[model samples]
Each structure stands twice: as C-alpha cells, then as structure tokens.
Target: STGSATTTPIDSLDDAYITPVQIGTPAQTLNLDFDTGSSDLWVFSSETTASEVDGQTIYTPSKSTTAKLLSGATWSISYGDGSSSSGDVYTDTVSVGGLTVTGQAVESAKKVSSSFTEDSTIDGLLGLAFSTLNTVSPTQQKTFFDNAKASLDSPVFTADLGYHAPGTYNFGFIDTTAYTGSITYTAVSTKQGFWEWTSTGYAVGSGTFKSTSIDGIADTGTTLLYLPATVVSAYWAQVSGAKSSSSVGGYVFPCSATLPSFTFGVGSARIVIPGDYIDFGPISTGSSSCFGGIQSSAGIGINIFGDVALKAAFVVFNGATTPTLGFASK
Candidate 1:
C-alpha cells in the first residue's frame, strides 16, 4: 500500500541514478535506492567506515525479524561524478514485487568508493530522472516518481530501457508488455533542473539538422549523448555526405557511407537518435570503416538523450497526474 506521502517535486538533476531495491521478508529485509532522481529513499550505513561496498549490498536492520531502521534523520548524496555520501535517517519495512512497502526513506553511505567497491549486481541507483538532478536532496527530494505516484495504478510510469541488455537494471511496475511502437508523447520542461524535454530540430543521416532552436534533455545520469558543437558540427555535416567520420569522438566526421536519419523534434514528438548510436565507436581515419554518429561534449549546452536515447523508448513518468511530465513510447 505505501501510502501517507504527498509532495514529489524536484525536476532536474540531469540524468540521475540511485538504484538499490531489495524489499523485505527473508525474515525482514529492505534495501533501497529507487529514485526518480529525487524522491528520497536511502541506505548504506552501519556507520560504514568504508571497506565492504565492493559490489556493495548490505542492508541488515538486525536481520529484520520484522523490520526497523529509522535512526533519526540526516542523509546525503552527490555525484555528477564529484561524489558524496552521508548517513543516518532510516525508516523500514519494504517489499517489491511481493508488495508490502511500509515507511520507506533510508540513507546510510558512511563513505564508499572503488566505483562502489565493485558493484554487487547494482545495489544503488534508482533515480527516476530529475529532482534538480538529485545528489540526495541538498534541496531536492520527493522522487521515485514522486513517491510512486499514487500507488501507481497507472497515472503512468513506464521505462524498460532494454532492461539488463548487455548488463541488467530492472525497476518496478510497467508490464504493458514491452511495446512495439506508436506510443508517442512528450511535454515537460519548465526549464532545467535537468529532466528536460523539448526538442524541435536536429537530424543527420538523411541530412537536415538545418537548425532552428533545438531543445532537449532526458538524461539517465548522462553517460554520453551530449551534442551541440553547433549541433555536433551540423550533425557531422550531413553524415559527411560521403559517410562522415571525423576521427569519431563527437563526430565532426572523417567517412563511412550510407548514413542518414536523425531527429529530435518533440514538438509533435520526434525522438530518433539513430546512426547506429552515432556509429557506436571505432573508425575515424582512412578506410573510414563505419562508426561516427554524434559526440562532442563539455555539456553540449544541454541536450542529452543519454543511455543511447534511453534504449530507444518506452519512458513515461507522469508524476501522478499533473505536475507536468510525460514521454510515451513503450
């Protein structure tokens, strides 16, 4: 049921993460991390001096017996890459899939690193995307789709993102059945805290990023998809016409061949980022080879699609009903 909450606002954190979600019952267990970038729910602290985050996954509130951990408050998180962590502040009883969901909100972190020691599958990073880009609310909380948006009967919160493709990282509720296409929708962007979305231009393979004020922002804690070096050099000057490849990296083009089909409109909904993912990688000189689609970072001034255009599509995060936020396409 997980009720008793209401106030989920925090719009941009610019591609976020804070995974972890272990729920309860092996007698009483409950690890957490699911965030929409900032809905706040924490973990990682027994006082944690370090050593044991290696692949990290340690949530033991006295073995649970039933569940308990609300040590009093005090939490922290920050990581554009800079990195940060704080502790204390727990509440307990959680369960996913099987259901349950009591109390919630946790935070433990007593300092960790190694890349999180190793990663133990993925015990952290559930950020739903934008709470001013949450680092654990220095001033941005209420995420997890604003606290699971009304128990989520379906105001809408869908994100498949290839779910574990090459790796793995599942989330909750969203079984419309994967999707096939035709689910187009987009409308959100009060103006940058980060989960931005408002494009209207940019294309390359077929040649036509002619420019006219392009705006877009949908980050998954940004890995790469930062355009804007004059829109990645006018989209590698139309795939360099003869198959652009400018040494690859951000693609100013150097050569490949048959390339064309780049879009990012969003006015009438147009998320397209293909070119085989700006060409994937490898190939920037002579023989040219193939790879080279889009790159050129720093911040591209802000217009990232990240996670390779979010594994293509199927992302709907409608903060319950209307605080405004939408992006459809299973």
Candidate 2:
C-alpha cells in the first residue's frame, strides 16, 4: 500500500493556512505554515529568545528521545514579506496526518524576525518547495515530502484551498470528488527551485485576451496574485476610482466600485477570478476604500500566482520525473 497523509488548514491572518504536525519522539505538535515558496522545516523552539516566544507553542528537542543535534549546522531564511527566521538543526521523526519520515532534518529556531515573533499563532514553516532551496549551511536539508515521497503511491500531492475557509492537503493520492470538471494539466519547470510555469496570457473582464506569456511561480506562501506591472495597471484600469495609494501601498479603490472578472490562461484552459474576490477587503477598519488583491510583481522580477489565484482551483503538485501541475475548478 502507498503511504498517504491528509492535512487540515487552520485559518490565520486572512493570508495563510496553518497545519498541525507532530515532531520528535514524544509527539510534540507544532502549528506550521505549509509554504511551497520555501524549502526548510524550521519551527519555533526552546532555542528562541524568551522575550520573542510570546504565545507560540515551541518544540523542546531535549524532551524527545528521538531527536539528535546536527553539530555545527545552522539555517537562516528571509521572506519577501520581511519575515525571517534562523536556527540550529536537528534530525528527528516528523509526522503529518499518518505519514511518518524518520530522521528528517528539522531546524529549531533560535531567532525570528518581528513578523514571525508577533504572529503568535504561527509556530513555524513546513517548506514544500524542492529541497534545493533549503538553507542549512554545509549541508542542505530535505523537506518532509522529499523523505516521504519514496513511499507514496504516485509521488503526488493535491492542495484544495478555500477562501476564508478551511482546506485540505492530501498526499500520495488524488480525491476526485474534491474538484469539479476535468483536471487540466501543464508541464512545470523546477530548475529555479520552484513550481514555475508560463501562462499563455490573461484578459481583464471581457476585454481581448493578451498573447503575452508570463513566467511565474505557483507559491502557496504568498497572499496575493502578483503579475507584471503592465498587467496590473491594465486590470486596475477597468475599475473606476482605482488608484495607486502610497498609504495603503498597492492599488486602492472606492468600496462601491463593481470589479470585473480577471482570467488567467493555463494551456488552452482559462481560470477566472470573480470580481468580488479581486476586492480583497477594506484597506482598514471603518475605511471607505478597498485594496485590490492582484498587484504588480515589478521589482520582484517574478510573477507569483499566490493563494488568491490558487484558491480558485484544485491543484495537483505532481512529483514525477518531470514535475507537472493539474488544475480544475472547485
């Protein structure tokens, strides 16, 4: 029988989904963010500064009989959102759902940036990107999926993300009932340590579809859909009163404006994000303005098809000889 695991999402900050994972011998649990944009399974632990701990649940490796220190090794990571964490390494048994990987590399954090320390609900990150992106010095670490893939039935995982709702991450198998219609697949390029793909083009509302191919990463860790600056400008143009705001950062519009549907192309299939989803929410509480969830990837240099896009479909992250992505409407 092929090994399989199922993870349930815990809604957080309206931007991320946290999942529970058991680590070490005594089965200490940690609430981790399953991030596809990164590749390290680092957690908040006893090593973190006391003042930084706040209400975060930490892992105490010494209490676990199966934990072992990886001498002279360390890891540090910084995110685009200004969050960062660094720590020492340990080898231990890590389990999610019912799937277990023995002797998996787990980084126990000794330091974390304000973004992480302040978010008491998020204890760590479960990196799902290719292992090549791991940050351990001298020797990089392998992700939970990497160590568990060998035992999987088909070396594939599916992500079913819902807007402001709990979702599921399934390993080693696909549940056909999770998605509607047939799954449309597209080849993925992992040379850059990401699930990168090229979209045929996009169209705003009912406008003509552009033929420009956009190179981007399918990143679950990110919150919004980041496209080229030109594409972003074209999209906001369709909504009246939309303007780039210095105070709110991205594009903001009057709360009353009717937004148009934004469509993205995957091969011959098109995924459409309805107007309501584009209007993220009010820029601030009691404010009359709203922020657009789709923004420019200008300086970042890479388009990111983040949660705002992924939540619109059921996604299959296939770990075949050549990785492939399958998507279908939910």
Q: Which candidate is the best by TM-score?
A: 2
- lDDT of prediction 1: 0.50
Q: Compared to the true structure, candidate 2 yields what TM-score?
A: 0.96
What are the models' TM-scores?
Answer: 0.32, 0.96
- For residues 1-330, could you state the per-residue lDDT of candidate 1 as single tens digits? 222111111112112233325544463332333334333455554556657565455666665554555545565666544555666645555544333445555555666555554545445444556455444434344444545555655545544454224212323344455555555565666445555656667666555545466556666545456666666666656554533334443343434454555676655566665565545433433544544535655543456666656655666555443434444454
Clashes of each: 50, 0
Candidate number with greatest lDDT: 2
Q: List all candidate RMSDs to the true structure.
A: 15.2, 1.7
